[PDB]
Subunit: 267 residues, 4 copies
Amino acid sequence: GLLDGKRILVSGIITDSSIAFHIARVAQEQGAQLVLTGFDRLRLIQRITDRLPAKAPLLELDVQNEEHLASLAGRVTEAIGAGNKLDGVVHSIGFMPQTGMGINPFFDAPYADVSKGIHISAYSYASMAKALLPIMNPGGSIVGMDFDPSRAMPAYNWMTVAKSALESVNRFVAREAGKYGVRSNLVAAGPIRTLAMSAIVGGALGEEAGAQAQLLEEGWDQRAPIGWNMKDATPVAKTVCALLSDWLPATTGDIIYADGGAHTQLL
Amino acid sequence: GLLDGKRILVSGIITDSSIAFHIARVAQEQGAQLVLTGFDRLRLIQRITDRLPAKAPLLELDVQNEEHLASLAGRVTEAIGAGNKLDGVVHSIGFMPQTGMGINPFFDAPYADVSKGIHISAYSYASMAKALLPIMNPGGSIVGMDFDPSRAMPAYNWMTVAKSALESVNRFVAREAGKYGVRSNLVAAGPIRTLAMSAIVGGALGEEAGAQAQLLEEGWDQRAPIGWNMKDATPVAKTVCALLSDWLPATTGDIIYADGGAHTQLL
Amino acid sequence: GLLDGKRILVSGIITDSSIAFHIARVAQEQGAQLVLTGFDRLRLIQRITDRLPAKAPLLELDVQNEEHLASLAGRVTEAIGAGNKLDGVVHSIGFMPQTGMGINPFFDAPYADVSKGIHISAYSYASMAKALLPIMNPGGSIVGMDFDPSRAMPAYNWMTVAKSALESVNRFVAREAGKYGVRSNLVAAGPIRTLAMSAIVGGALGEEAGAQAQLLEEGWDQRAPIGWNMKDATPVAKTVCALLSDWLPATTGDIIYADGGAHTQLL
Amino acid sequence: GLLDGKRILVSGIITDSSIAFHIARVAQEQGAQLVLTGFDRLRLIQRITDRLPAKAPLLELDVQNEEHLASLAGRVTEAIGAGNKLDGVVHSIGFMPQTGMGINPFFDAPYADVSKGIHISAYSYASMAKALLPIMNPGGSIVGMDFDPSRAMPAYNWMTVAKSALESVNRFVAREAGKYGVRSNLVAAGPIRTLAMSAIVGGALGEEAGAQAQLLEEGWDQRAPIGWNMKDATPVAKTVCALLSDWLPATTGDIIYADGGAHTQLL
Ligand SMILES: NC(=O)c1ccc[n+]([C@@H]2O[C@H](COP(=O)([O-])OP(=O)(O)OC[C@H]3O[C@@H](n4cnc5c(N)ncnc54)[C@H](O)[C@@H]3O)[C@@H](O)[C@H]2O)c1
Ligand SMILES: NC(=O)c1ccc[n+]([C@@H]2O[C@H](COP(=O)([O-])OP(=O)(O)OC[C@H]3O[C@@H](n4cnc5c(N)ncnc54)[C@H](O)[C@@H]3O)[C@@H](O)[C@H]2O)c1
Ligand SMILES: NC(=O)c1ccc[n+]([C@@H]2O[C@H](COP(=O)([O-])OP(=O)(O)OC[C@H]3O[C@@H](n4cnc5c(N)ncnc54)[C@H](O)[C@@H]3O)[C@@H](O)[C@H]2O)c1
Ligand SMILES: NC(=O)c1ccc[n+]([C@@H]2O[C@H](COP(=O)([O-])OP(=O)(O)OC[C@H]3O[C@@H](n4cnc5c(N)ncnc54)[C@H](O)[C@@H]3O)[C@@H](O)[C@H]2O)c1
Ligand SMILES: Cc1ccccc1Oc1ccc(Cn2cc(-c3ccccc3)nn2)cc1O
Ligand SMILES: Cc1ccccc1Oc1ccc(Cn2cc(-c3ccccc3)nn2)cc1O
Ligand SMILES: Cc1ccccc1Oc1ccc(Cn2cc(-c3ccccc3)nn2)cc1O
Ligand SMILES: Cc1ccccc1Oc1ccc(Cn2cc(-c3ccccc3)nn2)cc1O
């Protein structure tokens, strides 16, 4: 059991296909005690989480609500029992208005919208560290989720630009985080079939949405030396737990690529 | 002459210390017929432009102003005579509330503020692109000003994150600018003491900021294999003018490091 | 146990301060049955390995010897018993003649000598993948030691170049090793005083070179957001064990930074 | 004219479709006094060099020839008149045995051949810099030819490794030419149909060469935001002149991308 002891916060669950779900599962399979946080559809996230191995707490956290952020360390400490601190925080959060995604012209998305995506997808990583680092033991990890925005691509539009700032924010978080002996990292996963995969990126594609298999399976399974599997999230979960473990103890402000090696290949 | 005949629009002039002032001057010397935009202190900017070698038109461009961007389309054409287009555009524009800068803590920066910075620092590259690309001739360049943000650093804080996104946006303009025959690039300059810079370097933004800003400005020259001068703005103006020219016709979505080679060395 | 049941070959031990030795000890601690290789002073190496927490077989491997490579495939299976195969291979091997290193100019190293360093430090990575992939299991892992050569530096000179090579070779091996079910990566470690290093650090390879040394070695702890101490190889000896394990299953051709996060920071 | 009165040494011409040939032509149009260096078939190079828009001195230079480099500064001074110096060096030199190219398996290229490949196409950039830096005026430029080696790719095999070091070397020539006030940069060009393309890459690629070649132009013009045409060598010739002129006066140890901007895009 790799994450034994280790109390870990885990945000961004919505379905049993949602990335955070498998991070949560694999964590529990390795002896982690969890605290999970939801957003908007709580009765529904609630139903989902019972499928996880252990009975685990569920806090509400709209990452745009300044009140939810203040009362966060509060609500958490009362869930793992005061005295005990957090060893891990997982940030699997993202949103971006459909107006700056897929076939909708890049120039046409308004800043009002792109701000919302950037607030949730990237800034919220720093605002969560503010909230949680206090209630964290030294040697514990923060892990956030990233998709390689280092090159531009069709569809991913303004979410590329957001994830691009996520990366930057993550290198500045690892400094504040290090003051407490805590690491801050992102995992750059390949594509995984989840809700956002199909609803956000999927719907904003419209007619040229048959692209999603050409582009993708082209840029990933074809490129990856060990193959990629859009239907298999356990790889990226296994990788997220490695950063939560003590086994990458000198890695911080970094990005790990769980993408089948596809960013290191051109063809 | 170099930019002979070409019609370049240049934004971001505020003083004669400003990067935009030099890009403008060096341009004019090479035969560029200009158009300028300023922001806020228009009468004060009017004074400074008359110091440039030749007289050039001046337009008001609040980059946050929805009206301005829209009419900007026309106001320019009315300024160079309809039946004439721009063969280049320079975006030397930037901002961040003294809270995502300096001694001011990284976490303390409110998103309300971090956004106002990003709106002006990064997004407005796409703003101007959509605004102006219709009145742009094939063969033209768009050149934005950038500061190497791939690594974190003290004080610069949320401006790094904004510059980090501005780079990602640059690659998504490159794609749309490509329709019209235009290249999109950033010149990553090293530091020049200006209105914005020298403010935080004297302790106005804290004594511990001006401290960390020495180590930067000094250690930069050390690394630069051909040296670095905070006071000479001419080489970056010269480099920006090279992209405006006919001489880099295979560069787009890309970044040119005009930093005296500093980013390539470790010590 | 982490490598519980895995049978890993570890090259490159020469003292009890070699990055190798620690990788091997930590690997043994986690339940990994081992096989080792040594070079040159084989008699003294014998002494060293015995101080390991477990008995391990020792093979001779002059990575330049085109014969040693040829038999190596077989000599190993002989050492773990036919019908058994390796679940991991480690490559902590490197060498550069004191002419492309130190007070010695960059220009003065002859190609004869530069090549020797490149044969042992870079090419010899594919050398061993060739020799060993046949006898490797699926799920297996290849890991070799890297030192961040993306930016140039004083003194390291040609070993810098040979790492830039080694980095590229790693991405190719990944393609070939992917055929057998095997990931191939590099742990990019910070500086460790491991004899090899600590030689130049005291004035052996010049006093001005040893000067430029501690400016790096200390410039590191300052940059590293969680700090970095050069006398402790246990953080990196673990990050190697992370890749050998089954917890990094989506990563190949990649480079992991166990450097205390100093490659992410500028200051 | 752009390079008026400047004296420039261009190596590695061998056809009228060689890249160094177009670099020569375009420089002369800008008004440069050239000095060329060929290799082996010096008499045939001579027939080709009269095709140039001017007459210019042609020397013999086997970069693998200890005598040639040794005499090199000599027979150059002699051919531009003494008291005069160089302002420009173009390094357009490359080679790798067919054994480490195309479909010829990667592990099977012997280090014997992989070494010759490096030395010539990589090391030689440093050994020429030594040869000429003495005889260069401050303000000059050394320029190399590079293919983007950051990600791996089919066929380009061990030549990816050479170019992968040709960069690491170029960052060390940068700081030794720093001493003399001279810049050292590489131009990463896109694919351009030349002799080497057809003989070494399309030669060691079997019957399926030319098929991958037609499919590369397509899948590059695609990725390029401003398109790309393999038959036109002009744009990369124009980019290398931009690096010789005064106009990128603060760019050294760096790489300029002349690929139509394809590396910044993923699809
Ligand atoms: N599956 C992919 O292809 C993929 C690959 C790499 C990285 N990512 C990133 O990793 C994460 C995983 O996303 P996913 O694939 O699981 O889709 P998902 O929608 O199932 O998970 C994303 C989560 O965002 C949460 N969320 C949305 N708005 C919020 C707000 N205002 N405040 C707090 N939470 C909010 C949702 O409740 C949801 O559970 C995201 O950050 C995403 O951008 C996804
Ligand atoms: N000073 C340096 O050392 C340096 C180095 C590298 C990159 N840069 C970048 O170059 C650009 C400008 O640098 P600078 O030294 O000239 O700063 P500056 O303060 O001297 O002038 C920059 C411009 O910001 C403009 N601006 C602010 N808000 C605006 C808005 N809402 N709408 C339109 N314009 C607005 C101002 O009007 C001003 O003219 C920026 O993008 C900056 O990040 C500066
Ligand atoms: N010392 C550090 O701080 C440091 C940091 C990052 C990466 N590295 C890398 O890690 C590896 C080893 O570093 P180290 O700290 O263990 O120093 P070390 O000298 O103790 O280990 C280097 C190895 O070179 C081996 N060697 C030389 N020629 C050989 C050949 N022909 N065949 C087989 N082995 C040969 C030696 O036997 C020795 O074990 C290298 O690849 C090196 O560049 C070292
Ligand atoms: N062909 C492309 O599209 C392309 C793209 C990016 C970079 N490049 C680079 O540009 C340069 C030239 O390639 P090219 O397209 O002009 O092919 P080319 O063969 O027409 O020119 C290459 C030159 O290398 C010379 N050469 C080979 N061995 C030599 C040696 N031992 N000493 C001195 N000269 C030697 C050749 O004789 C020839 O003149 C190389 O560095 C190459 O890798 C080419
Ligand atoms: C949570 C969230 C909010 C907002 C946006 C996305 C999102 O979640 C993600 C969903 C999928 C991916 C990866 N991805 C994209 C597409 C694709 C389609 C077309 C072109 C190229 C990529 N396919 N696989 C990354 C994500 O971050
Ligand atoms: C217009 C504008 C508004 C708001 C902020 C910046 C800005 O413009 C810039 C001005 C100078 C630079 C370069 N730079 C960095 C530093 C430094 C500072 C603090 C700490 C360590 C380094 N000094 N000089 C970059 C800019 O983007
Ligand atoms: C195995 C081997 C053979 C030959 C040479 C090196 C070598 O191995 C390494 C030893 C130490 C390092 C890390 N490192 C570099 C320096 C340093 C010195 C001068 C300037 C700036 C850095 N100090 N610590 C990396 C290595 O690859
Ligand atoms: C001078 C020299 C000696 C030896 C080898 C190359 C060389 O020079 C070059 C020749 C052509 C290119 C461009 N390129 C690559 C390939 C390709 C085909 C298939 C897959 C992936 C790449 N096709 N076109 C680049 C070069 O640097």
